[PDB]
Design a protein around this ligand. Structure first.
Ligand SMILES: *Cc1c(COP(=O)(O)O)cnc(C)c1O
Ligand SMILES: *Cc1c(COP(=O)(O)O)cnc(C)c1O
Lengths: 404, 404
C-alpha cells in the first residue's frame, strides 16, 4: 500500500483550504472520491445515458444491464448469498427507515421491545422511536462503559421473550469502537430476535462478511466509501425480504395496477425501488467498489491501523487533551482540549488548514453520557498521512498555548 | 433558439447506437444531460467536496452554502413564495409518497374521498391507493375522453363534502395532454380540498408559476429536466409544510434526541430531509436549472411546438398509424402501427437507430381505457430535429411495408 500513489487519485487533496494545504481529517462524515469514480459516472452521462427500466432500445437496455451489474458487484463485496438480497437506497438513513416501516410495522406489535445501543447514530434511534410510538412497543438501550464500550453484562436483563429486533452499530462514528457483532448476533437469535447492523463506518476500513456475521439486516452509505452521494446499499436476508411488504409505491415496484382490481407488487428487491433509480449514483458506487477492492481492504486496514497507532502516540504530547473511546478505535479519534469548546478548537484548526468535525456528530445521547456538549472528531482514512497527523497535533499544541 | 448550438452541448447525441447515428426520441422517460451539467457536478467532486451539514471547516461550510443556493434557484424556477417551501427528494415518486404518508395520514380520515385522473402515472395512483387502504378512505377517478382529455363534466359528481385532496397530472406522459389545472385548482379549493400537481413532464416544456396556479403541492424530477438522476423537487405551501409531521427520521431532521425526554424535529424544509443529502445531484440540478433558464423556456417552447406540429404532419403519410391523444399534445406522441405490437415496431425502429419507448409507460389504467395492451411513445425535446422526425416516419413506413 502506497499513500503517495493513492492520494494522487484524489484531486481535492491537492487543494488549499485557507492559503494552506488542505488536510481533510473529516472522512468519517463523508469521504473524498478518486478520479476513477468521478469520471466513471461522468462518462456514463456523456456516452450512454438512458432510462434503466429494461426499455426497448439498446441504450436503455444496456443501462439496465449496467445497473444490475453493480448490484451483483456489491453483493460480492459484503458476501451476500444472492444479489437479490441487496436493495438500492439513498443511504443508511433511508435504509433503516425502510426496514423500520416495512418490517417493523408488521413484526413488532404493541408490547414487544426493541434493543439499541447508547452509542448509536441518530439514524439508528429516531426511526425506532417512531415505530415504538405508533406500534406501542418498548425501546431498551444497552448501557455504555467509560472506555466507550458496551456494558455487555447488562444483556441478559434486556433480552427476553418480547425482544423482536436488535439495532446495533458495527463501528462507532464518534468513538471508533467496533462492537462484538458476531456473538451478539447469535444471542439475539437464540431468543428469536432479528439484528440490524449499521455498518456505515465499517465497510471502508476492513472486509465484511454478512454471511459469517449472520445478521438479518445490514446497511451502509456509498458517499463514505469513497463513492458518490445519494446512493447506499440495504442488505436483507432473502427469506425475510420476500415476505416484506412495500413501503414506497408507484413507479416500477408494481406488477399490475388496476383502478378496480387493485394493484400488485413485483418480487424483491425491485419491489422496494419505486420510480427512476439513481442510475448515475449506482454507476459511481460500482467504480468505488472496484477501486477500493483493488487496493485490498486488508491492505487499507494495515496502513490505516499503523497511521492510527501513530496518531495516538503523538496525540499524547498534547497537554490537557481528553480522549474518548478505547485504544483499539477505528479510523476515528474523538477528543477535547481542556475546557475550550470544540467549536473554537475546531475553528482554530481550520485556520491552520485542517478539516476536523466538531459538535455532537449526530449522537446526542452518547454525548450526554460523557456529560460533554460536544467533542472534536479527527478521522484517519487511507489517503491520510503521518505529516497530516503531525500537522494536527502541532496545531492542538498551538491552540493550547494561545488559548490557555 | 438554435438546435445546432444546443445539440452541441449534449455528447450522447453524437453517438451511434446501432452502427447508425443515434436518434434519442425517448426523453419523456429521461432526458439527456448537457456538458455544463455533467461537469458542474464533476468539478464539485474534484475540487470542493465535503459534508453539507454546516460543519466547521470551510469546505463543508461552503458546500452547505452551495446546497442551499440551488434550493433558492429552484424556488425561483417555479416561482415559489419562499425557498423554505421546497423540499429535496429523490424524485416525483418519493415526493408524492412523502405527501401521501405525512400529509395524507393526518388529513384524510376513513370515510373521506380522494380524486385522481385516469391518465395518471403509477406514481400518482399507488401511493394514494395505499393511503386509502390503511386510512379507509374512498378513491374516485375522473373519467377520460376518447381524444385523451378529461371528462370535466363529471366533476360535480366527484367533488363533494368528503373530498380532501385532488392529485392530478400537469401534462400526460403518454398522451401529452395538458390538463386545465388553474380552473380545477379553484374548484377543489371551493370545497376545501387540496391539490397535488404532478408536473414531472411540464417543467421542461414551458414556464410554471406555482403561485399563479395556487396548487398546494407540486412535484417534478430533475433527470427529465436535463438534470442528474436521483434528485427532485417537492414544493408544498409554507402554511401546509410547517404543519406536516416527519416521515423519515434520524439524520438531521431532528432538533434534539433524548433516549428519555424523546426527540424533537427541526423546522421545514430541513425537517423532511434526514441523513446526508444528494449533494452531487443537488449541484447538478442547479446547473440544469441554469442551463435551461438560459435558453428561455419560452423559446424552447416555441421550437418544440414547431417540431411537433411538423412531426404530426409527416406522421400522416404513414398508413395504418393510430395516434392517441389530442392534437394539442406536449412533447409526446403515442401511436401504434396497425395490429403489430409496439414491442416489434419499437424493436425495428431501434435497428434503424431510433430510440422510442414501447409498453404501458407506467400508465396501465390509461391503456385499459384504449383497450390496448401497450403503445409506442416518441418524445420530442429541445435537442431533437426535423431530420430525426423524418428518420422516424420513414422507418414507420418501412416496418409497415415489411411486416404488412
Ligand atoms: C416520470 C414521471 C413520474 C416518475 O418520476 P420519477 O423521477 O421516475 O420518480 C411521475 N409522474 C409523472 C407524470 C411522470 O412523467
Ligand atoms: C454516517 C452514518 C449514518 C448516516 O448515513 P447517511 O448516508 O448520512 O444516511 C448512519 N449510521 C452511522 C453509524 C453512520 O456513521
Amino acid at each position: 500500500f502506497s499513500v503517495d500513489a493513492v492520494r494522487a487519485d484524489f484531486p481535492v487533496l491537492s487543494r488549499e483550504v485557507n492559503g494552506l494545504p488542505l488536510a481533510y481529517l473529516d472522512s468519517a462524515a463523508s469521504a473524498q472520491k478518486p478520479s476513477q469514480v468521478i469520471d466513471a459516472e461522468a462518462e456514463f452521462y456523456r456516452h450512454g445515458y438512458a432510462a434503466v427500466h429494461a426499455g426497448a432500445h439498446t441504450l436503455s437496455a444496456q443501462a439496465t444491464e449496467k445497473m444490475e451489474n453493480v448490484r451483483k458487484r456489491a453483493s460480492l463485496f459484503i458476501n451476500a448469498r444472492s444479489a437479490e438480497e441487496l436493495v438500492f437506497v439513498r443511504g443508511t438513513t433511508e435504509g433503516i427507515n425502510l426496514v423500520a416501516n416495512s418490517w417493523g410495522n408488521s413484526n413488532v406489535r404493541a408490547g414487544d421491545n426493541i434493543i439499541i445501543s447508547q452509542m448509536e447514530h441518530h439514524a439508528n434511534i429516531v426511526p425506532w422511536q417512531m415505530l415504538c410510538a405508533r406500534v406501542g412497543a418498548e425501546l431498551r438501550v444497552i448501557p455504555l462503559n467509560p472506555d466507550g464500550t458496551l456494558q455487555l453484562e447488562t444483556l441478559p436483563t434486556l433480552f427476553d421473550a418480547a425482544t423482536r429486533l436488535l439495532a446495533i452499530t458495527h463501528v462507532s462514528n464518534v468513538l471508533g469502537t467496533e462492537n462484538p457483532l458476531a456473538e451478539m448476533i447469535t444471542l439475539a437469535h437464540q431468543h428469536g430476535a432479528k439484528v440490524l447492523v449499521d455498518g456505515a463506518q465499517a465497510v471502508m476500513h476492513h472486509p465484511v462478511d454478512v454471511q459469517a456475521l449472520d445478521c438479518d439486516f445490514y446497511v451502509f452509505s456509498g458517499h463514505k466509501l469513497y463513492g458518490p452521494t445519494g446512493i447506499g446499499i440495504l442488505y436483507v436476508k432473502e427469506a425475510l425480504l420476500q415476505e416484506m411488504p412495500p413501503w414506497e409505491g408507484g413507479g416500477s415496484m408494481i406488477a399490475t395496477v388496476s383502478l378496480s382490481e387493485g394493484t400488485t407488487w413485483t418480487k424483491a428487491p425491485w419491489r422496494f425501488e419505486a420510480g427512476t433509480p439513481n442510475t448515475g449514483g449506482i454507476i459511481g458506487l460500482g467504480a468505488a467498489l472496484e477501486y477500493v477492492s483493488a487496493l485490498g481492504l486488508n491492505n487499507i486496514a494495515e496502513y490505516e491501523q499503523n497511521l492510527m497507532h501513530y496518531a495516538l502516540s503523538q496525540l499524547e504530547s498534547v497537554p490537557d487533551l481528553t480522549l474518548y473511546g478505547p485504544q483499539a478505535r477505528l479510523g476515528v479519534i474523538a477528543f477535547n482540549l481542556g475546557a475550550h469548546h470544540a467549536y473554537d478548537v475546531g475553528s482554530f484548526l481550520d485556520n491552520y488548514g485542517i478539516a476536523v468535525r466538531t459538535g455532537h456528530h449526530c449522537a446526542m445521547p452518547l454525548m450526554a453520557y460523557y456529560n460533554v456538549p460536544a467533542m472534536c472528531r479527527a478521522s484517519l482514512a487511507m489517503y491520510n498521512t503521518h505529516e497530516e497527523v503531525d500537522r494536527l497535533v502541532t496545531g492542538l499544541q498551538r491552540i493550547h498555548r494561545l488559548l490557555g
